[PDB]
Write a protein that binds this DNA or RNA. Structure first.
Length: 52
DNA sequence: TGTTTTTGATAAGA
DNA sequence: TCTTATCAAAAAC
């Protein structure tokens, strides 16, 4: 399978930075992942749906 | 088992 | 401007 994009100790690093007020669009080009990845790992609630 | 796991754009409701 | 799951496929082998 492919490699997990945030290299696990970075899941700590991020949880922290975004729960202490950090925008994902920001957090995704410094650690280069896609914003969709970050909402999959650390989400929140409700505004939703589907398709590619 | 030429599979898999996982990303990431993207529709989508909101 | 957001969040959400979907989905085609990259990347690993």
């Amino acid at each position: 399978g492919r490699p997990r994009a945030i290299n696990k100790h970075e899941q700590e690093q991020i949880s922290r930075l975004l729960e202490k007020g950090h925008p994902r669009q920001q957090l995704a080009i410094i650690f280069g992942i896609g914003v969709s990845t970050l909402y999959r790992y650390f989400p929140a609630s409700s505004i939703k749906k589907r398709m590619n």
